[PDB]
Amino acid sequence: AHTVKIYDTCIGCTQCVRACPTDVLEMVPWDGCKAGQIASSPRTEDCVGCKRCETACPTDFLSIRVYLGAETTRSMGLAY
Amino acid sequence: DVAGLVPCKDSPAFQKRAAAAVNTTADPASGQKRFERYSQALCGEDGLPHLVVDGRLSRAGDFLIPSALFLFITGWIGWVGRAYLIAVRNSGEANEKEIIIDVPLAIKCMLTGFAWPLAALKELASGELTAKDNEITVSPR
Amino acid sequence: VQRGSKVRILRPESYWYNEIGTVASVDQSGIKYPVIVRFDKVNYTGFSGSAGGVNTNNFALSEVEEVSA
Amino acid sequence: VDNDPVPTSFEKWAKPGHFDRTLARGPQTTTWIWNLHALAHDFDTHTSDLEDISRKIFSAHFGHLAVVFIWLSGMYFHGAKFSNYEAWLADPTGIKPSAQVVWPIVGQGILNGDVGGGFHGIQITSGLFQLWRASGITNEFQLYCTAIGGLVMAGLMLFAGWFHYHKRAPKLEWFQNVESMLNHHLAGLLGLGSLGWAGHQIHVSLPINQLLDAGVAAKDIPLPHEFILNPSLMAELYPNINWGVFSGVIPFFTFNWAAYSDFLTFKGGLNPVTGGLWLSDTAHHHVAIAVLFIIAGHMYRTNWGIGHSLKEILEAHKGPFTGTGHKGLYEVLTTSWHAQLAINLAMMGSLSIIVAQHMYAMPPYPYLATDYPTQLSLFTHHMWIGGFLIVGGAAHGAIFFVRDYDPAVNQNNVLDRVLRHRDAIISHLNWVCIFLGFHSFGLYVHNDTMRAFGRPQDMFSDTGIQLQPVFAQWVQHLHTLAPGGTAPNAAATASVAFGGDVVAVGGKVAMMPIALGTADFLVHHIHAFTIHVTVLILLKGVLFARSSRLIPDKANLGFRFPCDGPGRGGTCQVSGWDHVFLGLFWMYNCISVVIFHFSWKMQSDVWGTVAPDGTVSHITGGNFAQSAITINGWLRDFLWAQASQVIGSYGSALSAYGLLFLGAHFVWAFSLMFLFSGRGYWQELIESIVWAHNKLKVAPAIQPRALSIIQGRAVGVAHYLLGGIATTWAFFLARIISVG
Amino acid sequence: TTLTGQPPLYGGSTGGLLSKADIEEKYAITWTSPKEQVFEMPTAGAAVMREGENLVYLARKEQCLALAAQQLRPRKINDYKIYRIFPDGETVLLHPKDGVFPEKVNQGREAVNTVPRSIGQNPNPAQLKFSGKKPYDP
Amino acid sequence: MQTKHLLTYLSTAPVLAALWMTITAGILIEFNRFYPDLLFHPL
Amino acid sequence: VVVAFGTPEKQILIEPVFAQFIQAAHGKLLYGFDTLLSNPDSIAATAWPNYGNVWLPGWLDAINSGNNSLFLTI
Ligand code: CLA
Ligand code: CLA
Ligand code: CLA
Ligand code: CLA
Ligand code: CLA
Ligand SMILES: CC1=C(/C=C/C(C)=C/C=C/C(C)=C/C=C/C=C(C)/C=C/C=C(C)/C=C/C2=C(C)CCCC2(C)C)C(C)(C)CCC1
Ligand SMILES: CC1=C(/C=C/C(C)=C/C=C/C(C)=C\C=C\C=C(C)\C=C\C=C(C)\C=C\C2=C(C)CCCC2(C)C)C(C)(C)CCC1
Ligand SMILES: CC1=C(C/C=C(\C)CCC[C@H](C)CCC[C@H](C)CCCC(C)C)C(=O)c2ccccc2C1=O
Ligand code: SF4
Ligand code: SF4
Known part of the structure; x- marks a missing residue:
């Protein structure tokens, strides 16, 4: 599975969760920013690795990081 | 004379191909004047005006006078451009100015390029030429 | 810092490292990155082919050095 | 048709990026500049209303008609004032056509070689001289006033554009009045044009050319107003009509048409004195074309309850396999401008290909068949234009699917049902492509390997294992047992290429029977293979532009996007744009092989002395x-052998073709930098160059960026196409001008 | 489990399920539509949303989520549920697990794979040599 | 006034670049309409 | 371009006089530089204190007999 790590520069804009095509990320409570929310990845087994979340991330550098790892049927996006 | 080269005058191949001069321009003569000018050059085995880039102040017109001409013109160009870029960064409409040139300022910074090298020397003297290394962005390592 | 103070960035991962930006806000609450700095050189951020980036980012007080007042 | 919709002003000329929203914030990065030209003519992005889009399209079409008319006026001016039309008309074979006398600035005058008659200029290959003689022009002043007419016509189109955008722009129902438009374009644009040219054929072209085909030495014939004014000149040419301002047309109004049979003829073949088409046949042609087009422009119901609604014709046509059939295609074609552009570009590309493959084997202009530079140039030009427009039709089909497909209109119609079995369609096209590639190119390389082995009995040749094109040979047979058979009222065959005898004008060959052997079987199956792969790529881009098994939301991503990231294995070039990008190279391959086959087949079996x-x-x-039959033979006796002319071309009238041969090689190899690389490297390198500029306080306000992924691909494909096409162009021109 | 819902009026397509649906896993999206409407399937073509519960079996989770995002949400349908179904018949609710959609912060959700530093404070691979340690470990 | 929004349009980069290029090309070509074939300074 | 237009005399042709001088410095008297090892009287040729060149006749014949590829003419 691919590895999605969320770094504490997250401002909780939810843009990465809204852009995930495979429902990997979610907003969880966190007192580390003004928004009160941090992104999280409970479902990285469903991660395909498209890096749409990093495209959507507005922090510099990115608070969300996708590290492509071992390939499974789910991470390869095979419908077969 | 250098490196086994001879003047085009005592070069048989040169005169042979000068006897068959083509006409580059609309001159009735054209090639004749081209060849009588090329005669002063140092030709070779092929009878073609080879160039030496050596300082060699007798044969300095082959590099050095054109070298000075090019450097002066291109440094004029560069200094004019630098002056314009420095002078539009002051206004907050700089990005508009780089696609829509402020033409009076363009001519103003154009006409002062005639003293392009000397001013740069003062900049090299001053420190208003090169930016400090702690004021410019850099990637990690 | 304070709002409107020109500051230099000491964050290496940042696009605006060793560059100045105006402080637009300092968050009074105890968060890790309270300072909003608004630059004029936009970011790389955006899709491929998109003509723009962000000019606003967040930094800590230990990752920001006040050059002016 | 609304009054003053857009205020004519210079204000938006001062505002670059007005027509979009992302383009009007100033340029922060350099990509903005590229995006500007990337979004200039995408009118459906500019606004979101079909009325404004149609008005913009109308006013842009007026501008394009202006640029074509200024082009036509330029060519007529260069043929009136800077050519040797008259000298070429005096002695056809003895004078090569020419125009564009270059300025003798630095060596340049060497390209003004003699072509005949004291004229020193660039030998032109556009075929303009031949069409001018066919049209009936004798002197050059007619061409000067035709240039004047083209200039004022361009001015008319330009002012019409200004008027129909800014002053009185039409409403949507006008543009969507599709029946009246089709009626006015069949009957009025095409039929009236055809009739008027036959009105120029009967009164101008036939008499002038009948005189020219005898040895009259042009100038001794009257200006073409005399052949309407004075039917005495109409007497000795075709005397079986009364020829009067009332009397002559009465045979038309009384079905007395065998009277007209002296000039409305159906002879066929080529004129044995000129190598062109029989101009009486072209006149009778344009007459019948005019009649059929004015007939067909009376089919569509507009305002008098008479004729068809195209919707009823479409929605009527449905069968048991295709569900609801063509229900909703009316709305699809009357609401989507891209869906119409797809069909119109594909049809114009195919018809340009048809034009290429017709004007070579029926040359319809005097002294064009024995103008081998002209023949090769027009064939190859129309093939290339057609391939480009076909790829563009596929591109706009993909754009329609991404942007203008509504599933609610398209329920169980032909569109919906091809979307529902795209996988079967694409896999079967894939298999056909692999089969054709093997059983054509593997045959070729089998032939190379046998010929290198010294086993020519084991080759696919006419001396080895024969593959005879029996069906094409039978079709060729049927076109020559038919100028007396199944086309009784016709003297000669449709074309000499199907059979007959060597029509030879001058010392050269105009057209002879083109026999088809094993080599022709092989190149035709190669052409079928290349067409099928181009179709495979373009149809995969069209049918999978919206979704796939890999990315089910490509339509949300759009038509022109690089990828959806490195995941799912990697999703580079999934977009319909990128399939058009790949289909451009495959169109290049297809059309290059077709023009190579044409050039070698003419130079080996048809053209000559x-x-x-x-x-x-x-x-x-x-x-x-x-x-x-071998790739080695193609490399040796076509590419190595015939390129001798373009590489020995320096120091003569043909040096510029050698220069452009080299320059096009350069541009083609320049393309591969953009094609093989990616923008991460270039952005990283621009970063260090930005550091250097930052050090000397000279880094610009507009941030330097690498070109985008799509932009890099587009620059690569543009340079690749320009370089390859221009290399072939320079090769073709120099070879067939020095030898033909 | 025991997924209830009428199949939408779809003529079928060659882009639907394959062997993987029957031996490895498949997915189902169940939603409720207030009216009979039209939506584009991710396996291409138009389909008719029945009034009431609609059930669609797709081959990937991403196809179900694309159906939910480009068809259901712009048609004001936000009660869909995406499940993974195994060949033995086991059904697992996947997309709106805790009842709240993932882009709304929900109390009780815990953070997974959150690194308490920045990208710059990640270690160096040279110090992070032969070990299970990677530069992104918390 | 449109005499200021022609001036700004005929001050954009594509027009002024084309103008400056045409001008220097005119200098260079009319240089070679005059005294030709200058591969070296004659000296 | 200038060869294309029938004017090869307009070719910018630059002699590699630095590398030709190096070739002369190895002993090639073809270029007429009269420098080290191509002048028999330079202290590099004679090796004034030790007089122990001894390679030099063979090498000089090698460099100044074009039948080989030892420092070809450029
Ligand atoms: C004011 C304009 C300007 C100035 C002073 C410089 C200066 C410099 N450039 Mg740069 N450059 C420019 C424009 C400019 N450049 C533009 C428009 C481009 C995009 C094509 C580049 C692309 C570029 C690259 C890739 C590199 C440099 C490098 C350098 C440095 C070494 C010299 C050199 O390589 O020459 C070469 C410069 C070119 C070939 C660019 C073409 C010249 C343009 C057309 C001049 C621009 C004038 C402007 C359009 C009009 C200003 C007039 C104003 C009144 C309106 C030097 C400080 C090198 C470096 O990194 O430092 C060692 C280097 O690698 N430049
Ligand atoms: C009186 C002259 C006049 C004036 C003042 C305007 C003014 C305006 N027009 Mg208009 N227009 C005109 C004549 C004029 N037009 C004519 C004669 C036509 C018919 C062709 C049009 C058709 C037209 C359309 C469809 C639209 C406008 C629009 C506009 C507005 C936007 C300006 C802009 O960005 O485009 C300026 C464009 C240029 C300066 C370049 C145009 C390129 C020309 C036409 C073709 C060049 C081809 C030529 C062969 C060069 C190729 C280069 C190659 C060889 C290297 C603006 C207020 C747009 C609008 O409404 O804004 C939202 C828009 O929708 N115009
Ligand atoms: C069937 C249509 C048709 C055909 C075959 C021709 C053929 C010809 N025309 Mg043309 N012409 C036409 C329509 C056509 N015309 C119309 C509608 C106009 C008015 C705009 C003109 C105006 C015109 C002028 C001014 C001239 C000609 C001339 C000529 C001759 C020159 C060669 C050429 O055009 O290439 C052949 C063209 C094609 C093979 C493509 C024709 C297809 C058209 C564009 C659409 C018709 C489609 C139709 C429904 C079905 C046909 C499909 C087909 C593939 C089987 C040639 C015999 C020249 C001449 O006078 O000869 C001496 C000349 O100067 N024509
Ligand atoms: C009837 C003809 C026609 C029309 C009206 C259109 C119209 C359109 N096309 Mg299109 N297209 C066509 C034919 C046509 N196309 C053909 C024949 C091809 C195959 C090559 C394409 C392939 C194509 C693609 C891949 C795309 C379009 C797109 C578009 C849209 C925007 C294009 C734009 O902004 O302009 C911009 C034009 C330029 C910036 C010019 C670029 C340079 C050209 C391509 C090279 C010209 C070089 C020249 C021939 C010689 C070199 C000279 C040089 C040495 C100086 C627009 C609605 C775009 C879209 O997104 O649609 C919604 C899109 O991405 N088209
Ligand atoms: C000359 C280089 C080259 C070759 C050989 C190919 C070959 C192929 N391309 Mg390709 N292509 C190329 C350049 C090339 N392309 C370039 C430069 C681009 C960039 C734009 C593309 C873009 C492209 C696209 C977008 C597509 C292809 C497709 C294809 C396949 C066509 C189907 C086929 O013919 O089956 C047969 C294979 C051949 C004829 C190749 C030669 C094989 C010989 C004759 C047989 C060898 C005998 C035996 C196997 C040897 C075994 C040796 C043993 C020791 C192992 C084919 C394998 C299409 C495809 O997938 O087809 C269905 C496809 O969609 N190409
Ligand atoms: C080429 C060109 C040009 C030229 C043009 C022209 C010059 C043209 C024309 C034109 C014309 C000049 C045309 C015409 C026409 C026509 C027609 C098409 C007709 C008609 C008709 C009708 C409508 C008829 C009717 C009738 C009937 C049938 C019945 C009764 C009787 C009558 C006979 C009346 C220009 C310059 C632009 C430029 C370049 C290109
Ligand atoms: C003797 C001679 C020679 C040689 C030469 C040489 C060897 C040289 C060198 C040199 C060097 C070793 C150098 C250096 C440098 C450094 C630096 C550091 C630089 C610079 C630059 C700059 C700084 C610039 C600036 C500017 C200006 C001034 C203007 C425009 C703008 C700009 C910014 C670009 C030869 C044989 C060839 C020829 C003959 C003569
Ligand atoms: C070379 C290359 C670049 C670099 C190419 C660039 C930056 C194109 C721009 C180059 C020209 C020189 C820009 C011109 C800048 C100014 C407009 C010049 C002023 C013009 C006056 C002189 C008239 C990419 O960005 C790239 C991206 C993706 C895949 C492949 C590649 C690729 O191969
Ligand atoms: S897009 Fe980036 S900043 Fe926004 S919630 Fe996701 S990780 Fe945090
Ligand atoms: S290589 Fe480029 S096009 Fe391919 S997935 Fe990565 S970013 Fe996208």
């Missing part, structure tokens, strides 16, 4: 039947 005794000495001496 006739002896006084009547023996054809072909240009390359019939090497095609034995060399074109």
